[PDB]
Design a protein around this nucleic acid. Structure first.
Ligand SMILES: [Mg+2]
Ligand SMILES: [Mg+2]
Ligand SMILES: [Mg+2]
Ligand SMILES: [Mg+2]
Ligand SMILES: [Mg+2]
Ligand SMILES: [Mg+2]
Ligand SMILES: [Mg+2]
Ligand SMILES: [Mg+2]
Ligand SMILES: [Mg+2]
Ligand SMILES: [Mg+2]
Lengths: 65, 214, 149, 100, 61, 135, 141
RNA sequence: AGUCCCUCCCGCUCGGGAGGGAGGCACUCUGGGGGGACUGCCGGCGAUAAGCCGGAGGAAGGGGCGGGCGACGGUAGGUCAGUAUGCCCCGAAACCCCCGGGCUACACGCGCGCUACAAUGGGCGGGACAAUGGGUGCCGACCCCGAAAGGGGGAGGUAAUCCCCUAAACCCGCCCUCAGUUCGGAUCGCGGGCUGCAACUCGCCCGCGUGAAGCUGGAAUCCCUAGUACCCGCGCGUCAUCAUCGCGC
């Protein structure tokens, strides 16, 4: 109901129709799957060390080249 | 009207506008914590030296961010609450003094009505108005579809501030309410998760649309 | 204390109130029916605007003398709305300023320096500075930092 | 008992040569001369349309002419006055002398 | 002389004022005092529009 | 009888400041700094003094002459001149260190100037242009 | 005392408005002329119109009858140097309307240029007519 | 700015201001010469090369920022109505002067703009701060007359010296309180002026009066990355008079 915080640890690359989306690797900080590393798609400027609030932690973005 | 003790006000400590201290204001959200600047500072006017460098806006006091946000016309090329609002030659563009006065009076009203520190109320409002998930558009067969993605913290802060400013601007357009009163009302409503707040309703709609298209 | 130690508008208000005791200061007969410049639109609303204008002119002469009619006309100009055309700056009229200066000279507050304009007499300087001192004495009761000056 | 000399030219180097000649003339004699004062430069700027007709995008030329000036004060000494009266200036320098 | 001012002593006469191609007659009345002669000799013909031609609208080009 | 002079510049505004031993009186073109309006302009000048502290503030007298530019441009030039005069007078590097942390521009100045205009709607700006139409 | 409706010179005036703005409802009286007559009559222009007494109304109407005789400058009336009598006059409402109509009729009788322009309903003071002043319907091709 | 002298004000003068004269080149400014930044230093990636990414110091950091200069050619792109020029035509008119008209017409379609549709305001009184340029067929301070536009004299200036030249947005106090209104000022009546040989067609300015459409704009579509865009005024060109324009500040 409040989401789970995750920390960005690596930047993969830009994607999307107009280069508006970045793909990152994050580590869950809290919850059932705390500690796991998964990849996600982010909209907006982002750098290593930022914290995202994921509403659920079972969807993983498809890998890009 | 205004007392002479207020027209000629002399501060003696480093605090926001010489009237409010940000020593006890706390940010609950861990994602927005490093992006809401609360360092001690008297005058919130940095003369726009931050826009040059990437991520430079991180170290700009939040009150100056709000002042810059409301220093606008409001409805130039998209409709807010069903109307264009083109202020044109009677807008607040480049008039940073008037925006300063508007924000100061709004803070006074907020403190009078709720009895709390205005900066804390502003922090609560922006925490409640910041979305957590958004969507991007794809085109297939001549039809436009949505795909859900996540939002970085700085964009969350920017969207929250812009929506607060837009709601305040809409509340005082061709009505009897003044700009300062509308801003105070919008902040108070957003702080209490009241659906009548423009920013809170916009956040709810954004999150619902993003959820329904995962 | 001097004129430089007090805000201008408050001093003008006090001086305008005081000037009503001088028998030589009287509005002319055409005062009720005129505007203060071609860039204005409606007549003055205060029933005693003459004294305010005279006090402002006196304080102006104190600070920038010697000065003549044309420069004062430039000072009291402003922006004019021209209907469908863009706004423009314009000067003020001449009768008001000339009559005010003549009355002030008759009262002994200003004098005429040939080829240069009008300057403030010692009597007028004392007259302004005494009021300024009184105003500053009142003002520092609520702003303690003014005691140093 | 003092003379005032005004120099103006469109070339800086010739002006410097004439000023240095006057300075040396004053040096080789017992006479006080206030240094050459540089007065502000005159700029003449003219902006014109380039094309002869009116078709096409509008583009402009900005032509400029610069005029430099110097000022020199020297006390009237007949021994030194004759020397500066006989010095020959280039055709692109204007000189005027007056007694104050 | 289209710029001559009508004077009281001119009342009662008839004057032919050039209008560009011809002299038109004007009979001076007392209420004409103070006006120019050219005010009574129009120089343009009244306009009666015909049907708009090709190129009068975007779709006619 | 120490007298120190300093200079400040900000987009065509020039300020010259003189600092000496005194009682704490500061004047801008003859006016006491406490009467400067609007408030946003007054706070710009007062920041270096507030950072310095009350003890230093009440021990010196400063007189500033500023010309050119606008009301906001003149305030910043005076602020720069006052900061430089303060750091040079007391000559302690703890105060100098504090100024750099709070605002670097207090001591190094601001080199920004207006950009010259160009054709195609010259009067509006160097980069603003006339609206383009195709039919 | 207070009356919500006061009639002056055949026009009913609001009683809640300031006298200077209330008097502007009369055709032929603007804000400046109203202030002039208020000052001449010895009445505060900021008083409510609803506190007028009958003698004051009579005085105001008398002033409006012949302002020049009561000290209003000759360059402030709305018809100086009358075409028939040669005097300086101020007209209001029906008399003003008929005077304007008479002026236009005089222009029309002598077949002057301005008279023709009035008859045809076209601009009179030298405007261009190719682009603006369009009032009609589009004509097709 | 510090130092000296004279005069005048204030809380009566311990103190604090303003002018004037001596005096000075400190500060600002003006204009000649010179210094300063080079991927030079540090850590990574790449090949150990070319380079790229991130830091230290620094007024300035990676074409430091903004301009000038547009290759061989093409576009049968525009210009013979700026000037030069071949051919063909008029050559007592298609050459040269003078007077009066027109380019300014008006059911209508379109481009670029200005002013607004109001409180992120309108009005009235008062208080603040510029830069670029221009001046002898001219810029004109200062005095007098007039309500305004204007009128009569007139110092200084061939100009870092005299003048244009005490900008507006902004700030303080009072009136209006969401209304086609104290919003908007188109249109028209009467009167007063200036330039000019001449103001009707066909000029610009001022006073009083009158008070149109317009309550935020469909499908579409334009400009802009930092002292930039938005908002605010000013100078020059054109010019006897006339700027909703161009180029600049
Ligand atoms: Mg003013
Ligand atoms: Mg307006
Ligand atoms: Mg610009
Ligand atoms: Mg060709
Ligand atoms: Mg061709
Ligand atoms: Mg044409
Ligand atoms: Mg044609
Ligand atoms: Mg209005
Ligand atoms: Mg005409
Ligand atoms: Mg409305």
């Amino acid at each position: 109901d409040e989401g789970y915080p995750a920390e960005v640890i690596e930047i993969i690359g830009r994607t999307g129709t107009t280069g508006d989306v970045t793909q990152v690797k994050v580590r869950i900080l809290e919850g059932r799957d705390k500690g796991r590393v998964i990849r996600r798609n982010v909209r907006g400027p982002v750098r290593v060390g930022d914290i995202l609030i994921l509403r659920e932690t079972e969807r993983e973005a498809r890998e890009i080249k | 009207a205004k007392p002479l003790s207020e027209r000629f006000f002399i501060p003696h400590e480093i605090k926001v506008m010489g009237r409010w201290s940000t020593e006890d204001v706390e940010v609950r959200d861990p994602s927005l914590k490093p992006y809401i600047n609360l360092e001690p500072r008297l005058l919130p006017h940095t003369h726009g030296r931050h826009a040059k460098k990437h991520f430079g806006k991180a170290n700009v006091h939040i009150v100056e961010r709000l002042i810059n946000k409301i220093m606008r016309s409001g409805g130039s090329h998209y409709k807010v609450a069903g109307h264009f609002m083109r202020r044109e030659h009677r807008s607040l563009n480049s008039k940073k003094v008037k925006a300063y006065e508007v924000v100061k009076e709004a803070f006074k009203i907020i403190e009078k009505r709720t009895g709390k520190n205005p900066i804390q109320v502003l922090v609560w409002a922006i925490e409640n108005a910041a979305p957590r998930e958004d969507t991007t558009s794809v085109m297939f067969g001549g039809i436009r579809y949505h795909v859900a993605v996540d939002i970085s913290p700085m964009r969350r802060l920017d969207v929250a501030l812009r929506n607060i400013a837009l709601g305040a601007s809409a509340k005082c357009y061709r009505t009897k309410m003044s700009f300062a009163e509308a801003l105070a009302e919008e902040i108070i409503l957003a702080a209490n998760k009241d659906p009548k707040s423009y920013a809170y309703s916009k956040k709810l709609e954004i999150e619902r649309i993003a959820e329904s298209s995962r | 204390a001097t004129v430089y130690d007090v805000p201008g508008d408050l001093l003008v208000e006090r001086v305008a109130q005081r000037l009503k005791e001088i028998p030589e200061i009287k509005p002319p007969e055409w005062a009720p029916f005129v505007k203060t410049g071609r860039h204005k639109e409606r007549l003055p609303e205060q029933e005693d605007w003459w004294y305010y204008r005279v006090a402002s002119i006196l304080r102006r002469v104190y600070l920038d003398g010697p000065v003549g009619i044309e420069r004062l006309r430039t000072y009291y100009g402003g922006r004019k709305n021209r209907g469908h055309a863009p706004e423009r700056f314009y000067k003020a009229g001449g009768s008001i300023i000339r009559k005010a200066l003549q009355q002030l000279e008759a009262a002994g507050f200003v004098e005429k320096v040939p080829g240069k304009g009008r300057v403030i007499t010692p009597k007028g300087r004392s007259f302004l500075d005494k009021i300024a001192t009184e105003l500053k004495k009142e003002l520092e009761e609520i702003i303690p930092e003014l005691k140093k000056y | 008992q003092k003379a005032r000399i005004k120099l103006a030219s469109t070339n800086v180097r010739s002006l410097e040569e004439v000023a240095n000649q006057i300075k040396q003339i004053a040096e080789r004699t017992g006479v006080r001369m206030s240094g050459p004062i540089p007065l502000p430069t005159k700029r003449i700027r003219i902006v014109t349309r380039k094309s002869p007709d009116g078709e096409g995008s509008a583009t402009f030329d900005r032509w400029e002419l610069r005029i430099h000036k110097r000022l020199i004060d020297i006390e009237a000494d007949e021994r030194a006055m004759r020397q500066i009266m006989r010095i020959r200036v280039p055709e692109d320098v204007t000189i005027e002398i007056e007694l104050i | 002389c289209r710029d001559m001012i009508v004077l009281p002593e001119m009342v009662g006469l008839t004057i032919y004022v050039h209008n560009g191609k011809e002299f038109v007659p004007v009979e001076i009345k007392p209420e004409m005092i103070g006006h120019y002669l050219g005010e009574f000799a129009p120089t343009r013909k009244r306009v009666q529009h015909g049907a708009p031609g090709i190129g009068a609208t975007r779709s006619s080009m | 009888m120490r007298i120190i002079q300093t200079t400040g510049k900000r987009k065509t505004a020039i300020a010259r400041a003189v600092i000496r031993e005194g009682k704490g009186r500061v004047r801008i073109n003859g006016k006491p700094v406490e009467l400067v309006e609007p408030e946003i302009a007054r706070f710009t000048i007062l920041e270096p003094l507030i950072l310095a502290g009350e003890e230093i503030w009440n021990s010196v007298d400063i007189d500033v002459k500023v010309q050119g530019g606008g009301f906001m441009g003149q305030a910043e030039a005076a602020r720069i001149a006052i900061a430089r005069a303060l750091v040079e007078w007391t000559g302690d590097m703890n105060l100098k260190e504090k100024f750099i942390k709070y605002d670097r521009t207090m001591l190094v100045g601001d080199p920004r100037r207006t950009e010259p205009h160009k054709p195609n709607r010259s009067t509006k700006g160097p980069r603003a242009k006339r609206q383009k139409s195709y039919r | 005392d207070f009356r919500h409706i006061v009639r002056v010179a055949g026009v009913d005036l609001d009683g809640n408005k300031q006298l200077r703005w209330a008097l502007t409802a009369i055709k032929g009286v603007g804000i400046n002329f109203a202030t002039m007559v208020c000052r001449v009559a010895g009445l505060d222009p900021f008083m409510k119109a609803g506190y007028l007494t009958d003698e004051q109304v009579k005085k105001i109407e008398e002033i409006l009858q012949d302002p020049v005789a009561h000290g209003i400058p000759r360059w402030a009336v709305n018809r100086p140097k009358d075409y028939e009598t040669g005097r300086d006059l101020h007209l209001i409402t029906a008399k003003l309307d008929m005077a304007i109509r008479e002026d236009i009729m005089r222009l029309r009788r002598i077949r002057a240029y301005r008279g023709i322009r009035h008859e045809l309903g076209l601009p009179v003071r030298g405007q261009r007519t190719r682009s603006n002043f369009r009032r009609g319907q589009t004509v097709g091709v």
